[PDB]
Amino acid sequence: IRASKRALSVEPARELEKKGIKVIRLNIGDPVKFDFQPPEHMKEAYCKAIKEGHNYYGDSEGLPELRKAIVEREKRKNGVDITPDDVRVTAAVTEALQLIFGALLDPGDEILVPGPSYPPYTGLVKFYGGKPVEYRTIEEEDWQPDIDDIRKKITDRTKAIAVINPNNPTGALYDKKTLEEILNIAGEYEIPVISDEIYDLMTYEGEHISPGSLTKDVPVIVMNGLSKVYFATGWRLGYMYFVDPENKLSEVREAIDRLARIRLCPNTPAQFAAIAGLTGPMDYLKEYMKKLKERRDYIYKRLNEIPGISTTKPQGAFYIFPKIEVGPWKNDKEFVLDVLHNAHVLFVHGSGFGEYGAGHFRAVFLPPIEILEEAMDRFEKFMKER
């Protein structure tokens, strides 16, 4: 029994932890594994939904009331002119991507993705028979897209340009210029922009801008959800919406609807929790952002005062992506294993985020300053020796 070709093409610390060694894990982008939880009013709504009997299959498009709530939130934030019929509730951004790529992709079709890349995008495009094509982002510009690289990498087989902003793994925040220019290129070639907006409100200085706000003709597919901004990773709930005044995506939307129907629906009670998060008080976020900004400032400061390491200052999300300027290691994979075994600190090897990630590593600044301080002291010691 041989597995499918498509499925096969889809691409240590436990041995330490089983001995009783505590490794500082800076590899995991899940805020809920640290001092973060979904706000009380979201927990209450979820639990009230269950008890009140909202345990049935919902409409495949998602609950009308949640779709209404998404409209108002996106109008307030992004000024986009959308209706509930422009919105689809999904099982997180993960399922958004699945539906979108499933509906867009024929064999050998291409999607432009940033490099350094977010690995689930690469696996998903490959699985749906497509070819993911990394466009360059520039470290010296705090990981802004290289628009000439986007221009060069477009072929007539390109079915979309994906924008992940704010960015994982770099923490970049794309400005109006970058976005306007990506939209112009996409408009020339008559293709949609997919905008991953999960880290939305998770910015440190200066607001996020959605390409949905800026487009005139170019259709944008915006994806968002509760995982990061609402600290509800294990609840698997999200959405997508279309900014498409000229109705250029009507065939694609119809394809998305067929795929959504056959899969039945996302979680029902979680969608009451989502209504609560979207229409509720944002005080919880103010407080989390404060401590997260402190943690950003701290790890940035610590990493830059270590000789042989440099890094940008992340403007969004909760990742920092340092460069290993000098050292004995053949590659970043070997480097990360060195730090694991000898400093008991776990990063992610940069090259796991594609070719533009090589010679880098990714760290999360989700742990409290005390944990970061210990991590950075050890890592500073490790680097001085090497």
Residues in binding site for pyridoxal 5'-phosphate: 57, 93-94, 118, 168, 199, 227, 236
| Nearest distance, CB of residue 264 and its own copies, angstroms | 6
Q: Which stretch binds ligand PLP (CB under 6 A): 33-41, 91-99, 131-139, 366-374?
A: 91-99
Whether 261 and 62 have beta carbons less than 8 Å apart is answered as: no
Q: What angle do CA 148, 150, 153 make, to 5 degrees?
A: 105
| Nearest distance, CB of residue 224 and its own copies, angstroms | 16
- Does residue 225 touch ligand PLP according to CB under 6 A? yes
Phi and psi dihedrals of 136, rounded to 5?
-70, 140
Q: List the x/- string, 181-220, binding to ligand PLP by CB under 6 A.
A: ---------------x-x----------------------
| Nearest distance, CB of residue 51 and ligand PLP, angstroms | 21
Q: Which of 16, 43, 68, 94 touches ligand PLP (CB under 6 A)?
A: 94
Whether 197 and 224 have beta carbons less than 8 Å apart is answered as: yes
Whether 151 and 185 have beta carbons less than 8 Å apart is answered as: yes
Q: Kindly report each contact of residues 252-261 with a partner whose C-beta sits within 8 Å and lies 24 or more positions away, as own/partner.
A: 252/103, 252/104, 252/192, 255/102, 255/103, 255/104, 256/88, 256/99, 256/100, 256/103, 257/60, 257/61, 259/99, 259/102, 259/103, 260/60, 260/61, 260/88, 260/99, 261/60
Cβ proximity to ligand PLP, 93 vs 105, nearer residue: 93
| Nearest distance, CB of residue 249 and ligand PLP, angstroms | 20
Whether 335 and 361 have beta carbons less than 8 Å apart is answered as: yes
d(CA 234, CA 91): 11
| Nearest distance, CB of residue 81 and its own copies, angstroms | 20
Q: Which stretch binds ligand PLP (CB under 6 A): 19-27, 72-80, 89-97, 277-285?
A: 89-97
- Does residue 233 touch ligand PLP according to CB under 6 A? yes
d(CA 111, CA 94): 16
User: According to CB under 6 A, which residues from 253 to 292 bind ligand PLP?
Assistant: 264
Helical spans, DSSP H, in 246-352: 250-262, 270-279, 283-304, 332-343
- Does residue 227 touch ligand PLP according to CB under 6 A? yes
Task: Report the partner that residue 209 touches, choosing among ligand PLP, its own copies, none (CB closer than 5 to 8 A by kind).
Answer: none
Q: Which amino acid is at 214?
A: L
| Nearest distance, CB of residue 94 and ligand PLP, angstroms | 3
In the complex, which residues of this chain contact ligand PLP (CB under 6 A)?
29, 92-94, 118, 164, 168, 196, 198, 225, 227, 233, 238, 264
